[PDB]
Symmetry: D2
Subunit: 360 residues, 4 copies
């Protein structure tokens, strides 16, 4: 019943200002923080060797696209390695990102680990020494961070334990981040795996988010200085029943309205395996949903922003321009989508229509 | 978890429709559901015998005020006794309220009870046979209900137990109401008693509301079909530090923005002892606060709508017009207040 | 983290003394608090009209059995009606019970109610005005009470909500009882209904009891002044896999050892549909289980103590003695059973 | 409401057998897992340079004490460094411990960290990569571990957040340990600092332990394969009111009886700053307390077993025997105490709580 201010007014201002810049009108997040083991798969899909140089080159390709992406990208999430790499001109990637008006983010979790006594459920690790890491990342140009928790819909999942534990660790992560001037993006991803329908996903999403915000309250988290990265509400990837984009949007906005406090600065949806087009179309339908939405509704896409790019690159340096052009195209589309002004013109490409879903 | 639909689409529509009608633009709630014992002191302050007839006449006086209150009153909360009384012309009070465009509400809790092992804290009782009561009340004209829980700010209060128990009982009450087509007004009142400051009230209010909504989620409550009746965020009555109405508005709106889901149809503030003018001025400031508010911010006033009317009446049947006139003036004042149009004549710091 | 004593040393002593007397070595509880509607089938099963006199006569039949039952019965739970009835000699039933060395108990809940949004799950009501009721029952001879919560094992049950809510209401009930010098018997019954196996029942029982005791702690319940009335751990009533009495005993004792604090004075098992012999044999096996048991492990049987008595009675006064004889036989069998002295004539796998 | 066994019967048996050996009748735990920074202060109090060799020599001094300690020591908690050091004869310390009948333990937490928004409250870190660490430690001779959470009694502490978070992290630590065949010692230490009285400590201990066990239940922790290392219930250090050893024992045993499931194999009290003699007398009183105690009530003493030994050593090799004698004396005394047989000579109400 007693207040022991976790943050000073100055600290709150800094956090709030950062969170708002990232999701400013028409802007979204480029999630390019895939680890080596994670990106290696994406590189093998185009027969490109997974080396430090190739990774550096590919990230440079994305980060140095022409100025058309500047008004589209409010922030860029990088993996530790990339945060300390430099472009061909010697400029550190964080400087490159900032010079284009983007905020630099860093992935800080150390992956998922199994929860004993559950049916294949997990929690996420990475709290050890997090305070010092955040302090160092802040000095090196980072202003926000990302931490991913993973839940799955099944007959007995997500369990009470899985929900409680993941919500609690997210809260710990957010607390430490805010003590170091780092805006935490809270990511409680509910996988699309399974044959459940739209209402089932909506039910689970509402229960999970309710648990997430109660935990953030218990841990004294400054919501205005945070961002939420949830899954859109959609039927399972194996569901038979079909739904329109308007139905996905309505189910998504309703779940959020029923659980996310207005104080939360913004919601940055993960693409979760959806195709580049689908992710853009759904984000657009969401922003056009005829319900009051007190928070920015935009993107934090990884796969949905890189599909066509990776394919256009093919590991060949000579395809630089071609690849970048594909990325710019998706950034412009999503920038319009997070404003509810996106209308596919029909020239997205076969790559932009292919499912980016990966079984878990 | 798995979904076992507590409500059908039709039931949800009914509840949401009722909730929206009560807090429609410019409208608020007249809370006239005082019990015999609760109205006792007030009648004593005007030397009027606490008889059912005087209580009937007084309620009639308020319910039959002229048509000017119609666009100001979206709902009227009644005590059990009054729901079954009639005006002199024979019209049942519920009919009088509805004829003026108001929704009829009913108080259903059975008062507070002491929580053993706490420093004078309480929870509220009244769940027994509540479903049958709500069904009967619905049949008799009521569309919404009220249940009051009370919390106190002190050295060791509100405690974890009190916060948890009161939030849980509020959720049970809300669940039962919705099963019977009754919109529940969730009232977790944090008393203004004490010398604590504005920051302290905001902190406690935030923690209480966070607990309330987690409980409503656990109990599967349909938020669009509910209303919230909280205390405004203010310093304690014995606090020596002074604050402006704008600061009160900022703390209140900030507290709500951090805990109340957008899905909640409306917030109807209790007056909690504030004077008629003070309650109106603060509600006005709250609606003028430069922050985004996804829900209606209006009133559910008991004392703040009746103070002057009660004094003007003085238990004198011949003062009818004078008394009603005072109530009408406050109804008009608050209707403008919930629109941020009433005039008597750094957010990071929160 | 601050204490505000719910009970004084004197109040604790009274509660602890009562609880110990009820479960003293070799003693158990006769659960005869069936309501009019609950005893209806019992009476109609023997073609007996369900009148107040027949109910009075039947209760008298059990309560006035000979002194052989005295050392077997530490307590008798009665229904409101029976607490105020008298034997043929004019003696109030509470007096008849006490004169035989038994403590008088009273059922105080008001039945189960449906939890909206669940798959047919329930919580229990009865807290309204419970403090005053307890005060009166105490004056009228009762020293302990009973409150029954019901949980069910199914595909998605017991749910998180059902467990938390039932645990919480049991805590409220216990708190109110202790404030009035009444020892609360906490009964979180997990029904045997279903085809689930022994391990499933053990798992659910462990989770439910863990929730129950956390709630009791949160509500400042004095465990020494309470008793626990749980279901034994058994396979579902329709489970295809079969088990031995030793297995049931091991699962039951293991579940209790993992959740029930040593401070709890006693565990009084409900028979839950088991036959008279089955309930006695299982209770005996539980007491012979080769694990340390820090609490009395006895009975609180309703059906398992009355089955044969009811049939022998058949609603005829001339069968009084024959009927009482059957009751005595079961009282003697279970008294031996709660001591592990009854004869009908690898824990890591749990 | 569905079970997905975290452990097999074989795994449970292994954890249960380990836990029981550690707290077998008359046995307790030598807590010698002080970190380099913690042991630094210990070495300075005797004017001895804090070097690895001096640390090894000191740990060897305690571990190679004569056979008299064998029936007294059921387990020895070591710090990472020590688990990999060897005695002069080349025998790994883990081997030295086992050969004397003791079970080897390892401290695995990574210290406390501040909980933002609280009044100087903390939680404990060390879960990252803990599973891999536990598997490695098991392979290298350790069978149990220790994780310390710290709570403080003050005006607004322990707070709801502090209690919930510390209980939750302890449960995660316990879960990871059991998955790797390691018996976790759950240590929710409530500091004795402050002017609070005996009943205040008892109240707080009761609330903390109830939260600890609810969390262990939620995380499906196998209680029979765990031990509890709590503070004894005593008045605050600055408390003006005085209490007898009998009252401290009654408050302690009452607090435990109201919260610790009988399935818990044993309770190993920390000395928490009490003198060697006080810790032994209080432990003996706890064991003589006229109430039913379904678990072993013994010790897991650090300072209460090393105070005199450290002083007698003084960092001088010639004081080896004198130093070992001081340790052996405390081991024998506490061995008798955890049996309620302690006497100054040697081997020879309740409703108000």
């Amino acid at each position: 019943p007693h207040s022991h201010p976790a943050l000073t007014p100055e600290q709150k201002k800094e956090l709030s200002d950062i969170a708002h810049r990232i999701v400013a009108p028409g802007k979204g997040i480029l999630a390019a923080s895939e680890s080596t083991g994670s990106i290696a798969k994406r590189l093998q899909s185009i027969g490109t060797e997974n080396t430090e140089e190739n990774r550096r080159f590919y990230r440079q390709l994305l980060l140095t696209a022409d100025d058309r992406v500047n008004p589209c990208i409010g922030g860029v999430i990088l993996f530790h390695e990339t945060l300390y790499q430099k472009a061909d001109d010697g400029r550190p990637f964080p400087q490159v990102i900032k010079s284009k008006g983007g905020v630099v983010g860093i992935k800080v979790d150390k992956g998922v680990v199994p929860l004993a006594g559950t049916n294949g459920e997990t929690t996420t690790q990475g709290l050890d020494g997090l305070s010092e890491r955040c302090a160092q990342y802040k000095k090196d140009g980072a202003d926000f961070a990302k931490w991913r928790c993973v839940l799955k819909i099944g007959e007995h999942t997500p369990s009470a334990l899985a929900i409680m534990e993941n919500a609690n660790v997210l809260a710990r992560y957010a607390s430490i981040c805010q003590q170091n001037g780092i805006v935490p993006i809270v990511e409680p991803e509910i996988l699309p795996d399974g044959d459940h329908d739209l209402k089932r996903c909506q039910y689970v999403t509402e229960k999970v988010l309710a648990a997430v915000y109660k935990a953030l309250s218990d841990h004294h988290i400054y919501l205005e200085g945070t961002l939420l990265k949830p899954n859109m509400v959609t039927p399972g990837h194996a569901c038979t029943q079909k739904y329109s984009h308007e139905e996905i949007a309505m189910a998504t906005v309703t779940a959020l309205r029923r659980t996310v406090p207005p104080a939360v600065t913004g919601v940055t949806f993960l693409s979760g395996g959806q195709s580049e087009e689908e992710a853009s179309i759904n984000l657009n339908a969401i922003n056009k949903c005829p319900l009051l939405k007190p928070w920015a509704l935009t993107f934090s896409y990884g796969r949905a922003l890189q599909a066509s790019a990776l394919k256009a690159w093919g590991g060949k340096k000579e395809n630089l321009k071609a690849a970048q052009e594909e990325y710019v195209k998706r950034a412009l589309a999503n920038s319009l989508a997070c404003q509810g002004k996106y209308t596919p013109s029909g020239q997205a490409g076969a790559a932009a229509s292919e499912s980016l879903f990966i079984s878990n």
